[model samples]
Target: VVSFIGSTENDVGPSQGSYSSTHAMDNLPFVYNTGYNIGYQNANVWRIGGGFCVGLDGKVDLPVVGSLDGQSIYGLTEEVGLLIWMGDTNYSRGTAMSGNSWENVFSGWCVGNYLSTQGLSVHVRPVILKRNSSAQYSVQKTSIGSIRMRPYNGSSAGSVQTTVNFSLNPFTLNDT
Candidate 1:
């Protein structure tokens, strides 16, 4: 259970609302669609929060990040891990703490393991939300290799980085 809130560098201020993606991608190619229903309801059932890392010795893996700017989660069920993230759409507008010139928000689930560590195998399915309200959007799933704490230096130890990911469901957009 975790939640997030804040603004990216590309955006003007903190996130005012939320959105979801209906597709997934890997290396710029569509893969599979994770039929997810994300919304803001039943707070006690779900929790959300995440942030950015400054650096990483190598690739990391985890269920959620530390700093998630302007995001929230809800409706967590025992049978289904339902969650939602309300925040800025663009990752490039946010500040970069480490390694790359750009960053994107990633939200999803780990198929098997659910923890951040080094040299661990996990399946991740997330969506990369853009800055603009309407932009080319997509989802992605892959095998995460490792997960580490925040970086210290430029060489990749572990540093704080901000990003967010959410489930994909068209029905959630309209209240029934």
Candidate 2:
């Protein structure tokens, strides 16, 4: 199974401790009134890591630049350390890379910021955390949902540009 942490764009630095959407444009849950797992991807069933695209509030608008089916798209906005959750409300802060950018963890070009106008997309070969006897690890990309990121200036959200394109490279390794 593959999983990652979930928090809002504004919740990047010291403010990353909470999950409530400070602005309506954030389009995220304020208190997570529903769901068993409260942070990011909740489960590892079929269509693994599906929660990245969808949240307690709704589904993020996936990229539509190259392919009409952007259901597998994922992206990040900031470079600073993030507050990532494991299996429950319990969590820990990640260390910033040399450049303090998502470019450290993800391969390919990265863009956007609190002042930028467009979002970004990156290709990632995620590390799977769990596997079963019946599990299958294929080189092919999985049907994971989309996870688009955007820049916010106070209560205003920047516009999305569809010219950017990045294919999803899902990895399910060490399967029996």
Candidate 3:
């Protein structure tokens, strides 16, 4: 609802609720996706309305660019600052916002990050309690199934041994 300076309460917005300025403003006028959306056209800023929405991406973006410590989890980082940009075109009507092709475009960092391993081995998700490791030391497959690591044997020559199929469960060695 477009509001002119002389517009009535209902004319401005009947759907969008009103802030009680009868006596004074409420403690918190806006909540969540709710905002006093001005008729402006910007592509890099977030949006708010009479509601809220969070893209609840479970993971967080751990970037270093900051003044105090890190970016706000609510939204303000290159990796995942909850963006809500607005756009305009000749084929449009009414007051609304559209995702800009540049800034607010939803592109998961993981989607843009390197997938060099192709499909041979990939870490598609986070392993909080567990360890996420890559095994590429000469020929390492990372530690698996109670397997612990030993010192790297830097032997890249003709006569070398591989494959230690331990036949003993709960094996213990005080060093040979």
Candidate 4:
């Protein structure tokens, strides 16, 4: 079996954590052996709304660059979720506040998209932010998930941010 962990609370920041075991879904002998023996590798990517930067693939570039930490399970069904964290700061000017001052922003589910022996993919849905708050927003896929964040724009400083997390179960599959 695979264990995945993620948080939607914005104050918590964008973080993803996961682990796997063979105690469950043992019917696939090869899956158990490959997952436990070879282990999994982590992959990560970040994207900023609008035109911040461009990637080598000619797509919008992600602001943060990192790698997920774990092994992928081959030929076996798995469940995954994306954790998200949002906050406001003056990072743009290089001066920002610190600590847990940020409030719990939002929460939601994520769906897995692409899957392979190397790793999997995910696409997030809209997650609503807390009421009466002002902060910068960001997100990350803990496993192999992807996120699509949409911050509400209005006349006032306070606005709603929506995040959506999508993943594959036994019945449905996500290809994006």
Which number leads on TM-score?
2
Provide the global lDDT of candidate 1 against the true structure: 0.23
Candidate 2: residue 43 lDDT (0-100): 23
Tens-digit lDDT track of model 1 for 101-167: 2222222222122323211111212233222233333222222222222222222322323332222
Question: Which lDDT values do the candidates have, in the order given?
Answer: 0.23, 0.22, 0.17, 0.22
Q: What local lDDT does model 2 show for residue 117?
A: 20
What is the per-residue lDDT of model 3 for residues 69-102, given as tens digits with 9 covering 90 to 100?
Answer: 2212222222211212212211121112122211
Off by over 4 Å in 3: 1-31, 35-39, 42-74, 77-82, 89-176
| Candidate 4: residue 2 lDDT (0-100) | 14
Off by over 4 Å in 2: 1-136, 150-167, 170-172
What local lDDT score does residue 54 receive in model 1, on the 0 to 100 scale?
Answer: 28
Q: Candidate 4 residues 1-176, lDDT tens each?
A: 01122233211112232223324332322121111111121222222222222111101112222112321111111222221222112111111111222222222112224221111122222111221122212233322222332222321112322232322221111121
- The TM-score, computed over Cα atoms with residue i paired to residue i, of candidate 1 is 0.16
TM-score of 3: 0.15
Cα lDDT for residue 95, candidate 2 = 14
User: Which model is ahead, 3 or 4, in terms of lDDT?
Assistant: 4
